[PDB]
Amino acid sequence: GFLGAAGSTMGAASMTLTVQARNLLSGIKQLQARVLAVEHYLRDQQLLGIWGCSGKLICCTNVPWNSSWSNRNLSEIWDNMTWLQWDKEISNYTQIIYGLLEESQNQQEKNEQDLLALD
Amino acid sequence: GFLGAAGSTMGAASMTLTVQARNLLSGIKQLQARVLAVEHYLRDQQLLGIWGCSGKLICCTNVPWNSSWSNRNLSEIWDNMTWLQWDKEISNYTQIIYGLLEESQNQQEKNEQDLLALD
Amino acid sequence: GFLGAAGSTMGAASMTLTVQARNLLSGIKQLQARVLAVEHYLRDQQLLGIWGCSGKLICCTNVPWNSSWSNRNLSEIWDNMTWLQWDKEISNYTQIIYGLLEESQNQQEKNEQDLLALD
Amino acid sequence: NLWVTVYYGVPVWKDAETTLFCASDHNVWATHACVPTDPNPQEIHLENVTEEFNMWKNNMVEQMHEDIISLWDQSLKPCVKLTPLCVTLQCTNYAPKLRSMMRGEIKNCSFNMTTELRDKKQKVYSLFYRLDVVQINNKEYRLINCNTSAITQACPKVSFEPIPIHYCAPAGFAILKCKDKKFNGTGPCPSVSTVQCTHGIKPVVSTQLLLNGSLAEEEVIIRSENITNNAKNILVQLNTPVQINCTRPSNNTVKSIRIGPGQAFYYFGDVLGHVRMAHCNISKATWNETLGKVVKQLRKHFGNNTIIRFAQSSGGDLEVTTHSFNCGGEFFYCNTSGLFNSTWISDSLILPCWIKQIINMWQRIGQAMYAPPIQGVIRCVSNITGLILTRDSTTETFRPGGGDMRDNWRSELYKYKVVKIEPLGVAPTRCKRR
Amino acid sequence: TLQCTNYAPKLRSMMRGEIKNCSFNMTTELRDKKQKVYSLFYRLDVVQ
Amino acid sequence: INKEYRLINCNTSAITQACPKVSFEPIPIHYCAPAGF
Ligand SMILES: *[C@@H]1O[C@H](CO)[C@@H](O[C@@H]2O[C@H](CO)[C@@H](O[C@@H]3O[C@H](CO)[C@@H](O)[C@H](O[C@H]4O[C@H](CO)[C@@H](O)[C@H](O)[C@@H]4O)[C@@H]3O)[C@H](O)[C@H]2NC(C)=O)[C@H](O)[C@H]1NC(C)=O
Ligand SMILES: *[C@@H]1O[C@H](CO)[C@@H](O[C@@H]2O[C@H](CO)[C@@H](O)[C@H](O)[C@H]2NC(C)=O)[C@H](O)[C@H]1NC(C)=O
Ligand SMILES: *[C@@H]1O[C@H](CO)[C@@H](O[C@@H]2O[C@H](CO)[C@@H](O)[C@H](O)[C@H]2NC(C)=O)[C@H](O)[C@H]1NC(C)=O
Ligand SMILES: *[C@@H]1O[C@H](CO)[C@@H](O)[C@H](O)[C@H]1NC(C)=O
Ligand SMILES: *[C@@H]1O[C@H](CO)[C@@H](O)[C@H](O)[C@H]1NC(C)=O
Ligand SMILES: *[C@@H]1O[C@H](CO)[C@@H](O)[C@H](O)[C@H]1NC(C)=O
Ligand SMILES: *[C@@H]1O[C@H](CO)[C@@H](O)[C@H](O)[C@H]1NC(C)=O
Ligand SMILES: *[C@@H]1O[C@H](CO)[C@@H](O)[C@H](O)[C@H]1NC(C)=O
Ligand SMILES: *[C@@H]1O[C@H](CO)[C@@H](O)[C@H](O)[C@H]1NC(C)=O
Ligand SMILES: *[C@@H]1O[C@H](CO)[C@@H](O)[C@H](O)[C@H]1NC(C)=O
Ligand SMILES: *[C@@H]1O[C@H](CO)[C@@H](O)[C@H](O)[C@H]1NC(C)=O
Ligand SMILES: *[C@@H]1O[C@H](CO)[C@@H](O)[C@H](O)[C@H]1NC(C)=O
Ligand SMILES: *[C@@H]1O[C@H](CO)[C@@H](O)[C@H](O)[C@H]1NC(C)=O
Ligand SMILES: *[C@@H]1O[C@H](CO)[C@@H](O)[C@H](O)[C@H]1NC(C)=O
Ligand SMILES: *[C@@H]1O[C@H](CO)[C@@H](O)[C@H](O)[C@H]1NC(C)=O
Ligand SMILES: *[C@@H]1O[C@H](CO)[C@@H](O)[C@H](O)[C@H]1NC(C)=O
Ligand SMILES: *[C@@H]1O[C@H](CO)[C@@H](O)[C@H](O)[C@H]1NC(C)=O
Ligand SMILES: *[C@@H]1O[C@H](CO)[C@@H](O)[C@H](O)[C@H]1NC(C)=O
Ligand SMILES: *[C@@H]1O[C@H](CO)[C@@H](O)[C@H](O)[C@H]1NC(C)=O
Ligand SMILES: *[C@@H]1O[C@H](CO)[C@@H](O)[C@H](O)[C@H]1NC(C)=O
Ligand SMILES: *[C@@H]1O[C@H](CO)[C@@H](O)[C@H](O)[C@H]1NC(C)=O
Ligand SMILES: *[C@@H]1O[C@H](CO)[C@@H](O)[C@H](O)[C@H]1NC(C)=O
Ligand SMILES: *[C@@H]1O[C@H](CO)[C@@H](O)[C@H](O)[C@H]1NC(C)=O
Ligand SMILES: *[C@@H]1O[C@H](CO)[C@@H](O)[C@H](O)[C@H]1NC(C)=O
Ligand SMILES: *[C@@H]1O[C@H](CO)[C@@H](O)[C@H](O)[C@H]1NC(C)=O
Ligand SMILES: *[C@@H]1O[C@H](CO)[C@@H](O)[C@H](O)[C@H]1NC(C)=O
Ligand SMILES: *[C@@H]1O[C@H](CO)[C@@H](O)[C@H](O)[C@H]1NC(C)=O
Secondary structure, X not given: OOOOOOOOXXXXXXHHHHHHHHOOOOOHHHHHHHHHHHHHHXXXXXXXXXXXXXXXXXXXXXXXXXXXXXXXXXXXXXXHOXXXXXXXXXXXXXXXXXXXXXXXXXXXXXXXXXXXXXX | OOOHHHHOOHHHHHHHHHHHHHOOOOOHHHHHHHHXXXXXXXXXXXXXXXXXXXOOOEXXXXXXXXXXXXXXXXXXXXXXXOHHHHHHHOOOOHHHHHHHHHHHHHHHHHHHXXXXXXX | OOOOOOOOOHXXXXXXXXXXXXXXXXXXXXXXXXHHHHHHHHHXXXXXXXXXXXXXXXXXXXOOOOOOOOOOOHHHHHHOOOHXXXXXXXXXXXXXXXHHXXXXXXXXXXXXXXXXXXX | OOEEEEEEOOOOEEEOOOOOEEEOOOEOOOOOOOEOOOOOOOEEEOOOOOEEEEOOXXXXXXXXXXXHHHHHHHHHOOOOEOHHHOOOEEEEEOOOOOOOOOOOOEEEEEEEEEXXXXXXXXXXXXXXXXXXXXXXXXXXXXXXXXHHOOXXXXXXXXXXXXXXXXXXXXXXXXXXXXXXXXXXXXXXXXXXXXXXXXXOEOOOOEOOEEEOOOOOOOOOEEEOOOOOOOXXXXXXXXXXXEEEEEEEEEEEEEEEEEEEOOEEEEEEEEXXXXXXXXXXXXXXXHHHHHHHHHHHHHHHHHOOOOEEEXXXXXXXXXXXXXXXXXXXXXXXEEOOOOXXXXXXXXXXXXXXXXXXXXXXXXXXXXXXXXXXOOOEEEEEEEXXXXXXXXXXXXXXEEEOOOOOHHHHHHHHHOOEEEEEEOOEEEEEEOOOOO | OOEEEEOOXXXXXXXXXXXXXXXXXXXXXXXXXXXXXXXXXXXXXXXX | OOOOOOOHHHHOXXXXXXXXXXXXXXXXXXXXXXXXX
C-alpha cells in the first residue's frame, strides 16, 4: 500500500518504491493543485535526468560517500533506521550531494563523448 | 500519417509509432483539457519508466508469454490481425501483464545493483 | 549563472547545460502560462525521447553531418562562434536534422529488437 | 518461447467524452477564447477500418448547446438591462383601418418612462407587435416578459449572423468522421477517416425545418433513435437544397432614446410605407420533388403499401407549432401550413409570417431578450437542407414536431465521433531483454 | 417604512410580543402599481 | 441643465464611488518571467 513501508526499515522499504512512485500522478484552485503536482513531479524527473538516473527507480552513481554527512555504518543505516530518520540525519547535506551528483554526471557524459570519438 | 496504420497489420503498423508519439502532445475547461492530456501522457511515461522502457518506443522484457492470454501464433497475430482486434482479445489481461512487468523490472533493478556491487 | 555562458564560445558554453536545464523549471493567465511552459518542456523531452537520447544532455547519434548545412570546420565552429550565431546559421536545416534523427532511431530500435531476438 | 514486447504509440483508441476546443478563422458568435483554424486541415482515410457510430449518444451535442448558450449569455450580459420598461402600457391600434392580415398586429402603446435624472420622467409612445404585448384586463396592456422575467437589451452593435464554428480535439484525442453516404446515424461505418478538427458548424437556430445544413449527396437519409417509437423525432437529411426567400417587406422606422446614465433603449417607430406582412416564398415544384423523395424513403422504412399524410402541428407554443428563424437580427415565425398539407396514396407558395420582438430562446423560462429593431425592409435567402418529422394504422400521419435545438445540432454532428488514443499496448514477440 | 401591531394581543405563552403583524407598501411586477401587503415578522427582525 | 445643474457624468454612464479605504499611492511592481522565458 501507499506509504505502507514508511515505518519499515530502509532495506525493506526499498522494495516498495513502485507503489509510492505510481501514486504520485494519481474550480481554479484544484486546477492549480494539479499543475503544481505536475511541476513537482517534473522537477524530480529532471533532477534524475541531470544525474543520469531518469530510466530507473534505483540508480547507483559514481559519487563516493563523504562520511562527514553521516558516520553510521551500512548495517545500521539500512537495518535499524527508517527513511524518515535518515532524511533527518542528512537534511543539512542535500544541497551538497545534489551538486556533486550533477558534476559527476557532467564529467561522465563528457568522458562518454571522448570515448565515442575514438575510431 | 496519424493513425494511418490503424487498419494495417500489426507488423506494418509497428513502424508508424513515431507519428502517434508526436501526436500525443501536439477558457477554464480548455486549460483543464490540456492538464488532463498532460496527466495522461505523464501516466504513460511513468508506466514505461517502471518497466524500464522510458527511452524506447519498442522494448523487450524478461516476462514470458502465458499462452493462455492468446494461443495464436506470431504469424497470425502480426499478419492477420489489426491492433484494435488484438487490444480487444487481451482486454481482460492487460493489468496482469502490467503487474508482471513491474515485478520483472524490480527484480532486474535489484539484480543489477547486486552485480554492480561486485568488485 | 543562467545564460552566463550565452556569450561564451560554443565549446565553453557546452559545460553549463545543467544550469539551463535546472532553471527552465523554476489570475487564470498565470496558470495558463505555467501549463504552456510545462507543455513546451514535455514536447522537448518527447523530442529527445523519440531520438533515443533518454535523459542525456549531450546526445551523440548515428546521423552523419551532410556539410551542406554548414561547411565550417569543427575548430572554427566551436572556438570562434557563439551558440546564437550558430543557431541562426542553420535555422533553415533544423527540421531536416530532426527528421533524420527520428528515422535513424527507428532503424536502430528495429535492429536492436532483431539482435535481441537471436538465441 | 514468446515474451512480452511493449509498444508505445499503438494506433488503438477507446470511446471518450472530453472537452473540445473552439477554432474559427461585432458578432454575437465571435469568441475570444478561440484559435484561428488550420489553413490546410488534415484528413487521413483509414483503410479497412469499420467502426460503430451512434449520433444519438454523441457527446458533442451536449458541448454544442452548452457552448452556444454560454457564449450567448456572455455576449448579452454586457448590455443595457431594460428594468424601467416593465411598466403599464396604454395602447390603441396603429392603423385601425387596415383590412390586410396585419390588422391588429401592431399596437401603439404609451407609457411614462424614467429619465437620466431621477427627478424627471418622460412619456414615450412606441409600436409593438401583438405577440409581445398582452392585455391586462383605449386598452391597457403589459409586456409579456413581466409575466416571467426581466429583459436585457441586446447591444445593437452585435450581429447575429451564424459563423461556422470548428470543434477541435484536445491533444491525445481524435475525431473520426464516418464519411459514408447513406449512413443512417447508427451502427458500423466502413469509411471512417481521422480528423484533428471538424469543419465549421454554423449556430443556425430554427425549428421544424433544418436550414443551411449538410446535404446527403446519395439520397435522402431518414434518421431516428427508434423508427417505430412515436415519442422520438425523425431527422430527414435532404439530397437537394430547397431555396427559401423570407422577408419583412415593411419599411420600418427606428428610434432611440436615453433611459439612464449611459443606458439607451431602441424601439420601433412609425412605418414609412404601406404596411405589409412578413412572408416566405418557397418554390412549389422543388418542394413537390422534396416531398416525393421523403415519401419514398418513408415508404421504404414503414412499408410500400402505407398511405402517408402530412399535417400541421397539433399543438404547443409558437416555437413548436410554427417554423422560426433569424434573419439579420430579426426573428421570424412562419405558419408552414402549405408545406405539410398532403396525402400520398399508392407555382410558388407564400407562407404568412409574424414577428416577435421579445423571445425566449432554447426553451429557457425565467430569461428573456429584447432584440433591437432593424431599419427599413429586410430580405434573406437560405437553403432548407433537412426536415423534422414526428409520427402519430393504415395511414401514418406526420407533423413537423421539433422544438429541441439539440436535435438540430445532432443533425450536423451525426458524422463525427470523439475517441481517446491508447498509445500503449503489448504483444508477444520472440525477443528477450539482456 | 413598516407599520406594525401585535399579532396576538392576548396570550401568556411567553410569545406576547414575539410575533408582529406588519404592513408595507412594497412594489409590484409593474413599476407604476404598488401593492399594500400584510405579513408577520418576529420581534428580532423588526426594530422600531 | 438649462440654478439647476446636473453631474457631468449623467449623460455618459453611471458613476461608481471608489472605496475610500483603498489607497491610490503607486507601489513599484516587478515583472517576472515565467519559467522557460
Ligand atoms: C444561410 O446562409 C445564407 C448565406 O449567407 C444566409 O443569408 C445571408 O444572411 C446574412 C444575414 O442577414 C446577410 O448579411 C446581411 O445582408 C444584408 C443585405 O441587405 C446587409 O444589409 C447586412 O448588413 C447590414 O446589417 C449589418 C448588421 O446585421 C450591419 O453591420 C451592416 O452595416 C448593414 O447595415 C448583412 O450584410 C447575407 O447577405 C445573406 N446572404 C446573401 C447571399 O444575401 C442565411 O441567413 C442563412 N440562414 C440563416 C437561417 O441564417
Ligand atoms: C401613437 O399615438 C400618439 C397619440 O395619438 C401619436 O402622437 C400624436 O399623433 C398625432 C397625429 O397622428 C399628432 O397630431 C399628435 O400631436 C401626437 N401627439 C403626441 C403626444 O405624440 C403617435 O404618433 C402614435 N405613434 C405612431 C407611431 O404613429
Ligand atoms: C413572393 O412572391 C410574391 C408573388 O408571388 C411577390 O409579390 C410581388 O412583389 C412585387 C415586389 O415589388 C410586387 O411588385 C408584386 O405586385 C407582388 N405581387 C404579388 C402577387 O404579391 C413577393 O414579392 C415575393 N417575395 C419574395 C421575398 O420573393
Ligand atoms: C515494526 O516493528 C516490529 C518489530 O519486530 C516489526 O515486526 C514490524 O514489521 C515493524 N513494522 C513495519 C511496518 O515494518
Ligand atoms: C568530507 O567532508 C568534508 C567537509 O568539509 C571535506 O573537507 C572532506 O574532504 C570530505 N571527505 C571526502 C572523502 O569526501
Ligand atoms: C553499526 O552500528 C550499530 C548501531 O548500534 C552497532 O550496533 C553495530 O555494532 C555497528 N557495526 C559496526 C560493524 O560498526
Ligand atoms: C543542521 O544544522 C543546524 C545548525 O545550522 C544544527 O542545529 C542541526 O543539528 C543540523 N542537523 C543535522 C542533521 O546535521
Ligand atoms: C486492405 O485490404 C486489401 C484487400 O485486398 C489489402 O490489399 C490492403 O493492403 C489492405 N490495407 C490495409 C491498410 O489493411
Ligand atoms: C497460463 O495461465 C494460466 C491461467 O490460470 C495459469 O494457470 C498458468 O500457470 C499460466 N502459465 C504460464 C506459463 O504463465
Ligand atoms: C497459426 O494458427 C492458425 C490457426 O490458429 C493456423 O491456421 C496457421 O497455419 C498457424 N500458422 C503458423 C505459422 O503456425
Ligand atoms: C472478458 O470477460 C468478459 C466477462 O463477461 C467476457 O464477456 C469477455 O469475452 C472476456 N474477454 C476475453 C478476451 O477474455
Ligand atoms: C569576450 O571577449 C573577450 C575578448 O578577448 C575575451 O577575453 C572574453 O573571455 C570573452 N568572454 C566571453 C564570455 O566570451
Ligand atoms: C546533402 O545535401 C544535398 C543538397 O541537395 C542533398 O542532395 C543530399 O541528399 C544531402 N544528404 C544528406 C545525407 O542529407
Ligand atoms: C577553418 O576554415 C577557415 C576558413 O578560412 C580557415 O581559415 C581555418 O584555418 C580552418 N581551420 C581548420 C582547423 O581547418
Ligand atoms: C534561410 O531562409 C531565409 C529566407 O527564408 C534566407 O534569407 C536565409 O539566407 C536562409 N539561410 C540559410 C542558411 O539557408
Ligand atoms: C403617465 O402619468 C400620468 C400621471 O398623471 C398619467 O395621467 C398618465 O396616464 C400616465 N401615462 C400612461 C400612458 O399611463
Ligand atoms: C403568464 O404565464 C402563465 C403561465 O401559463 C399563462 O397561463 C398566462 O396566460 C400568462 N399571462 C398572460 C397575460 O398571458
Ligand atoms: C441503421 O442502418 C443499419 C444498417 O445495417 C441497421 O442495422 C440499423 O438498424 C439502422 N438503424 C436505424 C435507426 O435506422
Ligand atoms: C422501438 O419501438 C417499438 C415500438 O413499439 C418498441 O416495441 C421497441 O421495443 C422499441 N425498441 C427500442 C430499443 O427502443
Ligand atoms: C429568391 O430570390 C432570387 C433573386 O434573384 C430568385 O432568383 C429566386 O428564384 C428566389 N427564390 C424563389 C424560391 O423564388
Ligand atoms: C408532384 O406534382 C404532381 C402534379 O401532378 C403530383 O401529381 C405529385 O403527386 C406531386 N408529388 C408530390 C410528392 O407531392
Ligand atoms: C396557420 O393557418 C391555419 C389555417 O387554418 C390556421 O388555422 C393557423 O392558426 C395558422 N397558424 C398561425 C400561427 O397563425
Ligand atoms: C389542406 O389539405 C386539404 C386537402 O386534404 C385542402 O382542402 C386544404 O385547403 C389544405 N389546407 C392548406 C392550408 O393547405
Ligand atoms: C425606408 O426609409 C428610409 C429612411 O430614410 C429610406 O432611406 C429608404 O429608402 C426607405 N425604403 C423604402 C423601400 O421605402
Ligand atoms: C443552396 O444550394 C445551392 C445549390 O447549388 C448552392 O449553390 C448554394 O450555395 C446554397 N446556399 C446555401 C446558403 O446553402
Ligand atoms: C402605502 O402608501 C400610502 C400612500 O400611497 C400610505 O398612505 C400608506 O400608509 C402606505 N402603507 C403602509 C403600510 O405604509
Ligand atoms: C452629452 O453627450 C454628448 C455626446 O453624446 C457630449 O458631446 C456632451 O458633452 C455630453 N454633455 C455634457 C454636459 O458633457
